[PDB]
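Posting here for the record, re: nicotinamide-adenine-dinucleotide.
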Amino acid sequence: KIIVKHVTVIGGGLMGAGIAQVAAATGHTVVLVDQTEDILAKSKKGIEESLRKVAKKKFAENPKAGDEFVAKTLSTIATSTDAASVVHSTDLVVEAIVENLKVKNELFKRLDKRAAEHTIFASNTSSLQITSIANATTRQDRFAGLHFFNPVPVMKLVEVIKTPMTSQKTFESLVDFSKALGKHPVSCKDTPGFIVNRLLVPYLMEAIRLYERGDASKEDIDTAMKLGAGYPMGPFELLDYVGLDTTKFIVDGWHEMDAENPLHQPSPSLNKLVAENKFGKKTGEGFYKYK
Amino acid sequence: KIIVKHVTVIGGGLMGAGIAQVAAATGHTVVLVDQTEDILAKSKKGIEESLRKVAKKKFAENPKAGDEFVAKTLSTIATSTDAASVVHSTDLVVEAIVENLKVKNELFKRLDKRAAEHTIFASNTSSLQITSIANATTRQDRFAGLHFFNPVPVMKLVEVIKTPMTSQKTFESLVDFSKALGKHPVSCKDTPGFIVNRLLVPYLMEAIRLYERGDASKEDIDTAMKLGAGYPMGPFELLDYVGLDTTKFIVDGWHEMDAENPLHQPSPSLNKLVAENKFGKKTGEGFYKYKAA
Ligand SMILES: NC(=O)c1ccc[n+]([C@@H]2O[C@H](COP(=O)([O-])OP(=O)(O)OC[C@H]3O[C@@H](n4cnc5c(N)ncnc54)[C@H](O)[C@@H]3O)[C@@H](O)[C@H]2O)c1
Ligand SMILES: NC(=O)c1ccc[n+]([C@@H]2O[C@H](COP(=O)([O-])OP(=O)(O)OC[C@H]3O[C@@H](n4cnc5c(N)ncnc54)[C@H](O)[C@@H]3O)[C@@H](O)[C@H]2O)c1
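Prediction output follows.
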């Protein structure tokens, strides 16, 4: 079996940085790749700060160990601005760059030529057909989806997306890697939305349409789902938390792919908020105003 | 204002008994109504067993206290087989009987003649237009929906449904009553599913379709929604928990009113289980099998 040990994470953003951190924390050798030295420096800095925040807690009764732990985990993460030079002998490449199909495909088409034979390619894409990226290579049997959830270092779920061409060997390798990260992997075919978003987003859009219809206030709907369905956050609180722009992008995609399905119909309210740059918590305002 | 003190609860089933229990526990005088003295005896007995179970846990440091609590609550719950015999002096009627329009309308059409003038009529129905029931009476301004959730004694939410004719006075009165019960009322128009079921049920159906479509197993979908979305129960565990027959019933209704809507298309797997009398935890088998206690 191909036991993933050396991992190459391309993209030091919210997800990429978290992926790199959990891999390193769990004993894997990591090379985090991004476009500039500045982006990388900031990315690794946030990883350190996150690790320290946790250490200061579990190592109160021994500050020494705490710092050794952080230094150790942080020392097993390398950085680079040239992915091509790092994939020569990497066991796994996990991509988490800008959500743009053209950019992603060029990336892998290029990497496919440098990566070792056994190297597995995986995308953390939320709204893109894994197959639409696996065909940019001649490594389809070792290409798959590995979808994580933010905050990566906390969220225990990982969706292992297998395409019709993905081998069983590649699948089990990713399932074992997921468990090695201390995650609980589930399986799903290469369908839009996979499992979570496919069943969550459309529900959130329905929550918005109920409001636009004037049937109930945003506040009551949120209260209804929390007390009534036991959800951690009401649909609008969650919409703001995950980003209104992010949500809109996913739904618009499914809409352009099947403009007939009533579940993907655009929301006037959602568009207006995205228009006037109100993306939710990350912008200080979405359906609700924050801090 | 007219504060609800006397409540007539019609239906001693799962929902009704719970409603009576919470109302009586919070200081309201209650009359539980059902078809036979036996059914009523069984319901009130179930209310006692529930109160004593809550007592042993709350008054563990003083069983005597817990016995007084139970006895006091149980004492303010009278039982009658004909509601018309007590509504002339009740403040609110909360109906929770079989889910059938004709039966409900016949019930309220007749109670309308006994209930005092100030009496408010409320239906706990899940799949019927409140308005449809209200027009069986000439008291539409004092008619509304008061939708609870099982187990009533635990679930804090209560949906107060206002029809175009419900008066502001009736609405406020029901909201206050909701708070007096220790619940949290939310407002919604008389639309199919109200809030919770309108957003919950269609989602449960998509879960089933995702599975029947063979994109993922039931087990992984449940795991995915529990860990990825933070839900207490995965879609298939919740389906089995609320009732596959209860669910199929609600969806068929919506499907019937708007047959072209894809969101209400029937589930082959759901129908098959329902047809085989596999209703979920109620029968020991739904999408999953359970220990027939
Ligand atoms: N945004 C979310 O809420 C979310 C949640 C789950 C999964 N995702 C998935 O994660 C990936 C990135 O999302 P994010 O939130 O981490 O993004 P982000 O914008 O925070 O970070 C992406 C990083 O990629 C870098 N980047 C862009 N193009 C690159 C290229 N050609 N090569 C190398 N680095 C490049 C950027 O400079 C940036 O630092 C996407 O594939 C997306 O579908 C996003
Ligand atoms: N099942 C749920 O989870 C749920 C949740 C919310 C609301 N509801 C609603 O609650 C109501 C009852 O549901 P339930 O689960 O409590 O039912 P149930 O089957 O447990 O009990 C219904 C009770 O109504 C009585 N009944 C029938 N016809 C009657 C009549 N003409 N007069 C007086 N009593 C009569 C029966 O004898 C029975 O004891 C329905 O309107 C339903 O849509 C159900």
